[PDB]
């Protein structure tokens, strides 16, 4: 019913175990489908059979799994899921994924039965602000800003002094620009260097963190007068 | 000091633990002194020097986990067929003698396990025969009566074990050489699945068919020896093959045992009585006994005799024979047999291989619905002078029941069935399919407990000692498993009425832990004549520890097991006390949410409640 | 930062890990530890666990301070205000260093064991008996760490309460200015200042604290190895201002072993007898090389007859001695170096008396392992504590001792510490001493064949047997053979064997005499020796390292300069070591620089000298140059310096190590203390025997760039896994047999002999 | 039962480390192109030593398998049928079998099994 459907991201697990596609029938109207709290990068449904009135028909794909391979297949099947039985529209009973009560009783579970299937729902779910972004900062905030950037598919640019040439945020970034020198004033605070850095790397935006040029309004204004988007409030507000 | 004759492996280990490195060295030195080589004792071609015993023992002390070595300081004999580097190798042929610079892989394994080699043991020359008379080093007598033959070709090894000099010995078996001498000497003879024991460092003599074999006084020791030597060696022995995972460990009580429709005895009247009685005893273990025409198997045996397999022996010896060594070095019966190979060309060898494959089609169709064959080990207890009179015909007859086993890729265990009127022993060999060696052992155990009730079982020449504890088995070690760890909570528990389903799928008991504090247990509305529980993982907070049994279920078999699991149960995962997650029975909410459902958590398990 | 661990279940926003250099420049934020609970109380508990589970070492942090706050009644009852922390009562369960003392280090016992084959010394206390007394007096588990005081001690402010004791040398000891007794459990209050002054008798004393001192382990031990910036309080001796934490069971989350015993004054019969007059008898086992194949008879007599004076250049690496000059049985040491004390590098015994040229030194607990000189005798395990109390100017005499007597003394110290009962300590006395030095050669196996050479077994200390292959000669096959011997003990799994240490043509075997005695181990070894089977065509896994090296850079040259102005200002290998190689071999200096950049150096052993420092040999026989090791050795060598000792090559993996090889240039250290380097090696020592090192040319300034990059794991070491094939190598020798032989026949002569003569002065 | 019906998009395809062409210059181009095409399906290509397999191949030729043809054809050949019915290259290949003992046949069966140990691991 879930991530093993044709086109979804655990389908491969059926091919690994030499499964063979049989058909695409529905349950009888006796089920409810829940989208479990996403934890992994894979979202997973759980089926729930009801002593009525309220179940619906959910879409299923049915596979022949060699007796010889079924062991290999279930070893890939984690809590709170399991293999039990399900009733098809036609009245035949057939092995299927089921789900522990505990499973669909977690915070974040969404009742998905309306959509009648798990495909429908992963389509009713499925916007890049900037292409490359420079971080006018160092240390821990730089690293944290870059995690978000990464997750967003946005290219990131580090800047560093000389003592920082070996720091995490330099490593984490897609690109980096040495500012040369040691002191705060020599490097991170030097607007000219920073803006040249964003130029040099074609960064459309600069995000400052806190400290340094963060609450510096000349700097916010320099960004504006340079066609680089300062990720922060206006020089005036500051 | 103290008598050592007829000690089990366990007897030896017990001595070593409670003794000192020096008084245990003395016991082996003393054992070595009592043995005599050459023609004085025909059983020994050669014996180790006292210096070599020291060497092996220094080697041994050298080890730092002794008391984990299952054969620590245990003496063994090895067929002069099989290389041990401390002694020459002869094949019962004086001018063939050579000094190996390296141990048999098989020997090397036993030494790694702590054993000490005492000597090389006499055999029919080039391991050719079932009689044991065909050695220029002497004719080894039956351990019970010197008028009788010891059996061959592993003659020394049987003798030596039979009188308890040594609790284990190595032989070889192409077409009976590890089975016939067991029957004639009241021993256990284990003939393992082909390729299980390496043949690296044994002199080839029917390479494609040959197996290393073991003699023991009891099942326990045969088992330990098997576990030690059952090891792959693919790149150095072209016929080596790895045992698969999850070997069966017990046949069902139900098993189908086939016996032959026609049992020729060639005039012999005592041995039929032992066989009949032995068959009665198997029936009494609960086995299904089925009478079956062994035609195809005998056609296979005839193919061996008619065919060109003799060219294998010739292939291994022709360079040597052309050396023209002194006639007195040779047994003439052996050599004439081996030279029978000259009349077969390559084309001939193929024609017979074709016929062999054709017979096997028939043989595999026959065995499809059979678990085990039960066969007399041999029809006769030959007198020394009887095989002197008819030096070929006695041999042929002693191979009535042995010749087809290796050609058919079967395993085999020769096991005592008792004594004839004249106080000689014989017995039965149980024949199983590929990789059944552990289950054969167990089947013997079960056979023994009926045939030798009240611990009345003799061993070797020791007609007035009794097996107590020594025929018991560990089964295959956890080493060999590869399956899903599965927790059962309900009707699949030991003693309830679906336990059998685990046995059908060759499950193995692992342990009996409890869940974590997170579970309730229900009794569901009974519909069948079986009542069924469902587990529920809970977290309001109010769960108990529910009791579980955990089994290893082989991966290739899990399909068969889950197919027997009806709604509303299913297999998911469960949390044990220790925090490990493990596959387990679960239950759809719908299951324990019916009218008739009973909250059973109180009892902590499903047994208490039923 | 030296170790960095965070709870993985919390969110922690940080920018640091094991390896990171934290500067004072910008802002000292390390990490932000963020916890998410069901409600305030759940979150406060989670935050405490998270803080408990946060281990960051290498810098002083505010973790303890955080822990105390997160734990307070204040924070929980939510009586929080912008003012609170300004009047918050913070008391560290710890002491504080008001003054450091000359050389005060955290140590433990037995120390950093397990790694002598690598050249990681045990460290731990220099006088282990006093150390363990001190611990026992306070009822510590014997694994507890304590402070070693050398020459004069610290003054410490205690911020919490505990019990204390001092043992070892005579030192005046103060608690809030009232004299305090040694060997008794002193109760310390809080605000107390403990101060221990100058050591009047002996060199060293020991200050124990109930519950031990709380410092992270490195390689199994909390002992300080200062040379390697390893262990103890952040890899070094204490400093003014340091703050060391204790293990109060109620106010602690600690992995230190809780005390075993109630505190108790040491019985006085169990106290060791320190000399009274700067003069000492010191028991040793004869061997390995106290035999006439190496030293003349009479010099062996003089060695034990005359007294030795302690030299001002003595410390935990070893205690240097002044006395009679050695008469040698050989005219030179051949390929292993010209000076007759020079030896095919082999692994030394703790306590060994090493003849670095014509002067000896006692190898102590911070001492070298794989080394290039002969050793005469070895201080008995249980006698080493004496050597830990020597001061310059002391006189000593080495007193011969049988294996058995040596065990007696040792066992008496263990029974003394374990039971703590009057009368159980045995000490040197005339009826314990052998009448005359004995023969260190325990047995000789004759040569049998080409791959199965003669074997010489030498007694090498209370704790070891040295196994030597061949004539005094290099032969690659013998290296594989040693590997096979080691394999035979493992196959055999021997009980009692502690550690086997590979050298060039030898292996040193350490045993536990309580599990196997000398005679027994000898026989097993003789016996396994015959089980070794292999043919000339062997192969081994071999990693190939390509390493940048600056030829004769400033720091290499300065190491020689320092040696000229501080120790020996001229010698035949002075003023320039490379010119010496060039001159004694009759080549141009740039021929020497050519070989270094072309030769394939096979690692034969590790810890020549310290932290996985290799002893390697060119695979091309035409790359083997005559030479010599220093006489006497340097006391200082720079990190990464490359040396040539006779025909052997070494990389000094550690900064500030004694050294004797001819100095030639500099690489990067092949020791990665924090395993942060950019390579696929899973422990700190980058090399393994049978590995290969090749050098490629860089500029001094290009090398300093690489060095900094590599210390921060931003330098990509060129390493390839492959296989060394002896049958392919034999092949190669033939395709160049004629070149090789012509090179070999023409190597020595009268010129090399004049050198060998001069070198010997 | 359950014969596989598809390799994974991932499968491991082995090609030989050494590809002898015996002077032929055109065919190597097609092979190269074909391997390229396989790579492009998403298959993983690994270059592998085919020695043991060519060792196995020579056994068919040097070895005694030629005796299988002789076994299948000798009764007929002994009739000496008209030379013009026979092709001479074939019959001579086939009569080459006479040079093999039963013993020889085994000797070669052994070597075959030894190679197969290596091939099945490979």
Break the fold down into its secondary structure elements and pairings:
This is part of a larger assembly, with 4 copies of chain A.
Chain A lengths: L11 H5 L3 E4 L7 E5 L9 E5 L12 E3 L5 H5 L6 E7 L5 E7 L10 E2 L6 H6 L8 E4 L3 H14 L2 E6 L7 H5 L2 E4 L12 H10 L4 E3 L9 H8 L4 E2 L8
Parallel strand pairs in A: 8-9, 8-11, 9-10, 11-12
Antiparallel strand pairs in A: 1-4, 2-3, 2-7, 5-6
Give a concise summary.
This is part of a larger assembly, with four copies of chain A. Chain A is an alpha/beta fold and 238 residues long.
Based on CA atoms alone, the radius of gyration of chain A comes out at 27 Å
Give the terminus-to-terminus CA distance of chain A: 54 Å
- Which structural category do the helix and sheet elements of chain A fall into? alpha/beta
Chain pair forming the biggest interface: A-B, 30 and 34 residues
Shape of chain A: elongated
Quick one: biggest sheet of chain A?
5 strands, parallel
Strand order of the largest sheet of chain A: 10-9-8-11-12
Secondary-structure element sequence of chain A? HEEEEHEEEHEHEHEHEHE
Please count the helical segments of chain A.
7
Oligomer: part of a larger assembly
SS strand fraction of chain A = 15-25%
Question: What's the total number of strands of chain A?
Answer: 12
Helix content of chain A: 10-25%
Features:
part of a larger assembly; 4 chains; 238 residues; alpha/beta; 5-stranded parallel β-sheet; 3-stranded antiparallel β-sheet; elongated
Describe this structure in words.
The structure is cut from a larger assembly and holds 4 copies of chain A. With 238 residues, chain A is α/β, with parallel strands linked by helices. Chain A contains 7 helices and 12 strands. In chain A, strands 10-9-8-11-12 form a 5-stranded parallel β-sheet, with helices on both faces. In chain A, strands 3-2-7 form a 3-stranded antiparallel β-sheet, with no helix packed on it. A two-stranded antiparallel ribbon of chain A has the order 1-4. In chain A, helix 7 links the parallel strand 11 (205-207) and strand 12 (229-230). The longest helix of chain A is centred in the middle third of the chain and has 14 residues, at 139-152. The radius of gyration of chain A is 27 Å and the shape is elongated.
């Amino acid at each position: 019913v879930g991530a093993h459907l044709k086109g979804l991201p655990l389908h491969w697990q059926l091919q690994k175990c030499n499964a063979t596609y049989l058909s695409s029938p529905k349950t009888s109207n006796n089920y409810k489908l829940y989208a479990l709290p996403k934890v992994g990068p894979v979202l997973k449904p759980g089926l729930r059979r009801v002593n009525d009135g309220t179940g619906s028909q959910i879409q299923l794909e049915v596979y022949s799994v060699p007796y010889d391979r079924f062991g290999d297949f279930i070893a890939m099947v984690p809590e709170p899921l399991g293999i039990g039985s399900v009733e098809l529209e036609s009245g035949e009973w057939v092995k299927s994924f089921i789900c522990e009560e505990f499973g669909y009783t977690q915070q974040g579970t969404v009742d998905i039965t309306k959509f009648g299937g798990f495909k429908p729902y992963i389509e009713h779910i499925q916007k890049k602000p900037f292409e490359t972004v420079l971080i006018a900062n160092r240390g821990e905030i730089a690293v944290r800003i870059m995690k978000t950037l990464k997750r967003m598919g946005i290219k990131s640019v580090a800047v560093y002094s000389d003592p920082d040439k070996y720091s995490q945020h330099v490593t984490d970034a897609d690109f980096s620009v040495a500012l040369h020198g040691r002191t705060a004033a020599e490097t991170y605070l030097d607007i000219d260097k920073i803006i040249n850095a964003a130029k040099k790397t074609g960064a459309q935006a600069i995000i400052p963190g806190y400290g340094f040029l963060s609450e510096n309004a000349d700097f916010s204004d320099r960004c504006s007068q340079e066609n680089i988007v300062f990720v922060g409030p206006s020089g005036d507000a500051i | 000091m103290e008598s050592t004759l007829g000690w089990s492996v366990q007897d030896w280990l017990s001595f070593h633990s409670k003794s000192t490195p020096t008084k245990s060295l003395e016991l082996l030195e003393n054992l070595l002194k009592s043995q005599k080589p050459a023609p004085e004792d025909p059983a020994w071609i050669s014996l180790i020097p006292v210096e070599d015993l020291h060497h092996q023992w220094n080697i041994l002390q050298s080890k730092s986990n002794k008391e984990e070595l299952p054969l620590y300081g245990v003496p063994i004999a090895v067929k002069d067929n099989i290389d041990y580097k401390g002694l020459p190798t002869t094949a019962a042929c004086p001018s063939y003698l050579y000094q190996p610079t390296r141990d048999s892989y098989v020997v090397e394994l036993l030494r790694d396990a702590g054993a000490v080699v005492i000597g090389k043991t006499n055999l029919d020359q080039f391991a050719t025969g079932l009689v044991g008379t065909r050695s220029p080093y002497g004719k080894t007598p039956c351990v019970f009566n010197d008028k009788y033959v010891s059996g061959g070709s592993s003659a020394g090894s049987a003798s030596v074990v039979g009188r308890g000099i040594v609790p284990l010995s190595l032989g070889t078996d192409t077409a009976g050489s590890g089975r016939v001498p067991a029957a004639l000497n009241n021993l256990i003879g284990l003939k393992p699945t082909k390729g299980a024991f390496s043949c690296r460092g044994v002199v080839p003599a029917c390479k494609s068919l040959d197996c290393v074999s073991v003699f023991a006084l009891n099942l326990s020791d045969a088992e330990i020896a098997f576990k030690v030597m059952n090891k792959p060696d693919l790149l150095e022995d072209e016929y080596s093959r790895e045992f698969p995972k999850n070997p069966i460990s017990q046949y069902p009580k139900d098993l189908t045992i086939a016996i032959p429709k026609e049992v020729p005895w060639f005039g012999e009247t005592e041995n039929p009585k032992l066989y009949t009685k032995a068959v009665a005893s198997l029936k009494n273990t609960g086995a299904k006994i089925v009478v079956v025409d062994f035609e195809p198997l005998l056609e296979l045996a005839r193919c061996l005799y008619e065919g060109a397999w003799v060219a294998e022996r010739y292939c291994a010896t022709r360079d040597f024979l052309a050396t023209n060594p002194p006639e007195s070095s040779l047994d003439e019966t052996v050599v004439n047999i081996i030279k029978g190979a000259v009349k077969f060309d390559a084309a001939d060898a193929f024609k017979f291989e074709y016929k062999r494959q054709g017979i096997l089609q028939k043989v595999n169709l026959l065995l499809k619905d059979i678990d085990v064959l039960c066969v007399p080990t041999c029809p006769l207890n030959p007198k020394l002078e009887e095989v002197a009179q008819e030096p070929v015909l006695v041999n042929s007859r002693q191979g009535t029941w042995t010749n087809f086993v290796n050609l058919a890729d079967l395993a085999a265990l020769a096991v005592p069935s008792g004594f004839r009127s004249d106080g000689l022993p014989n017995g039965i060999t149980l024949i199983g399919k590929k990789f059944s060696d552990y289950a054969l052992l167990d089947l013997a155990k079960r056979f023994f407990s009926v045939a030798f009730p009240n611990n009345s079982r003799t061993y070797g020449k020791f007609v007035d000692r009794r097996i107590t504890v020594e025929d018991e088995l560990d089964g295959p070690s956890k080493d060999t498993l590869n399956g899903v760890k599965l927790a059962v909570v309900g009707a699949h528990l030991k003693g309830l009425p679906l336990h059998w389903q685990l046995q059908k799928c060759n499950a193995t008991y692992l342990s009996s832990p409890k869940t974590s504090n997170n579970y309730k247990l229900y009794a569901l509305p009974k519909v069948g004549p079986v009542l069924k529980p469902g587990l529920r993982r809970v977290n309001d907070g109010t769960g108990s520890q529910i009791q579980l049994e955990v089994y290893s279920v082989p991966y290739d078999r899990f399909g068969d097991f889950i197919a027997m699991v009806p709604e509303p149960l299913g297999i998911g995962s469960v949390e044990l006390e220790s925090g490990e997650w493990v596959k387990s029975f679960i239950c759809e909410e719908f299951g324990y949410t019916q009218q008739g459902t009973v909250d059973i958590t109180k009892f902590g398990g499903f047994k208490p409640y039923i | 930062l030296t170790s960095v661990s965070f709870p993985s279940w919390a969110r922690v926003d940080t920018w640091v890990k094991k390896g990171t250099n934290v500067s004072a420049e910008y802002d000292p934020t390390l990490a932000k530890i963020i916890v998410h609970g069901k409600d305030r109380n759940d979150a406060i508990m989670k935050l405490n666990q998270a803080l408990n589970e946060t281990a960051v070492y290498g810098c002083i942090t505010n973790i303890d301070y955080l822990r105390s706050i997160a734990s307070s009644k204040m924070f929980k009852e939510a009586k929080v205000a912008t003012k609170v922390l300004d009047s918050f009562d913070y008391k560290p369960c710890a002491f504080e260093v008001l003054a450091p003392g000359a050389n005060t280090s955290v140590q433990d016992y037995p120390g950093r064991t397990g790694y002598w084959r690598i050249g990681v010394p045990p460290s731990g206390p220099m006088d282990s008996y006093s150390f363990r007394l001190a611990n026992r007096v306070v009822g510590n588990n014997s694994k507890s760490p304590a402070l070693e005081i050398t020459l004069n001690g610290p003054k410490l402010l205690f911020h919490t309460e505990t019990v204390i004791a001092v043992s070892g040398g005579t030192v005046s000891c103060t608690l809030n200015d009232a004299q305090i007794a040694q060997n008794e459990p002193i109760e310390v209050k809080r605000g107390d200042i403990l101060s221990v002054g100058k050591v009047t008798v002996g060199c060293r004393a020991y200050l124990s604290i109930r519950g031990g001192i709380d410092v992270p382990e490195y390689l199994g031990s909390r002992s300080t190895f200062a040379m390697g910036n390893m262990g103890g309080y952040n890899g070094r001796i204490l400093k003014l201002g340091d703050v060391l934490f204790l293990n109060q069971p109620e106010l602690s989350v600690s992995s230190l072993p809780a005390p075993d015993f109630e505190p108790q004054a040491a019985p006085k019969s169990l106290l060791p007898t320190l000399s009274t007059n700067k003069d000492w008898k010191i028991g040793v086992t004869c061997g390995p090389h106290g035999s006439i194949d190496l030293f003349k008879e009479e010099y062996i007599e003089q060695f034990f007859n005359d007294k030795w004076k302690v030299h001002y250049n003595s410390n935990r690496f070893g205690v240097r001695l002044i006395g009679p000059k050695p008469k040698w049985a050989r005219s030179d040491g051949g390929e292993a170096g010209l000076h007759p004390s020079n030896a095919h590098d082999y692994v030394y015994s703790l306590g060994a008396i090493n003849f670095t040229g014509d002067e000896p030194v006692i190898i102590t607990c911070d001492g070298p392992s794989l080394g290039g000189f002969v050793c005469q005798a070895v201080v008995a395990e249980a006698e080493l504590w004496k050597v830990g109390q020597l001061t310059p100017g002391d006189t000593i005499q080495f007193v011969p001792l049988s294996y058995g007597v040596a065990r007696q003394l040792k066992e008496s110290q263990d029974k003394s510490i374990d039971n703590f009962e009057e009368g159980s300590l045995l000490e040197l006395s005339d009826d314990k001493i052998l009448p005359k030095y004995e023969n260190p050669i325990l047995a000789v196996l004759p040569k049998k064949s080409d791959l199965s050479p003669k074997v010489t077994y030498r007694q090498a200390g209370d704790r070891y047997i040295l196994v030597e292959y061949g004539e005094l000669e290099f032969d690659l096959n013998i290296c594989y053979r040693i590997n096979r011997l080691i394999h035979q003990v493992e196959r055999h799994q021997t009980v009692g064997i502690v550690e086997m240490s590979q050298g060039v043509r030898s292996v040193l075997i350490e045993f536990d005499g309580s599990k196997i005695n000398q005679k027994a181990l000898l026989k097993c070894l003789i016996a396994y020796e015959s089980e070794i089977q292999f043919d000339k065509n062997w192969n081994v896994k071999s990693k190939i390292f390509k390493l940048p090296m600056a030829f004769e850079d400033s720091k290499t040259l300065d190491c020689v300069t320092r040696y000229r102005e501080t120790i020996r200002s001229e010698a035949p290998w002075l003023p320039n070591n490379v010119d010496f190689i060039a001159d004694v071999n009759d080549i141009d200096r740039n021929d020497v620089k050519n070989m270094l950049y072309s030769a394939k150096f096979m690692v034969l052993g590790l810890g020549d000298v310290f932290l996985g420092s290799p002893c390697a040999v060119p695979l091309d026989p035409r790359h083997r140059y005559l030479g010599t090791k220093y006489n006497p050795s340097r006391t200082y060598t720079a990190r990464g310096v490359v040396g040539i000792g006779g025909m052997y090559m070494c990389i000094y993996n550690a900064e500030g190590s004694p050294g004797g090889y001819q100095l030639v240039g500099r690489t990067i250290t092949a020791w990665d203390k924090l395993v942060i380097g950019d390579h696929p090696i899973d422990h700190p020592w980058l090399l393994t025997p049978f590995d290969q090192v090749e050098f490629y040319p860089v500029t001094e300034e290009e090398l300093e760039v690489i060095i900094e990059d590599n210390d921060n794991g931003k330098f990509k070491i060129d390493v390839e896994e492959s296989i060394f094939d002896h049958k392919e190598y034999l092949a190669w020798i033939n395709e160049n047999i004629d070149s090789i032989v012509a090179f070999q026949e023409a190597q020595g002569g009268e010129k090399a002999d004049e050198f060998a003569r001069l070198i010997q002065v």
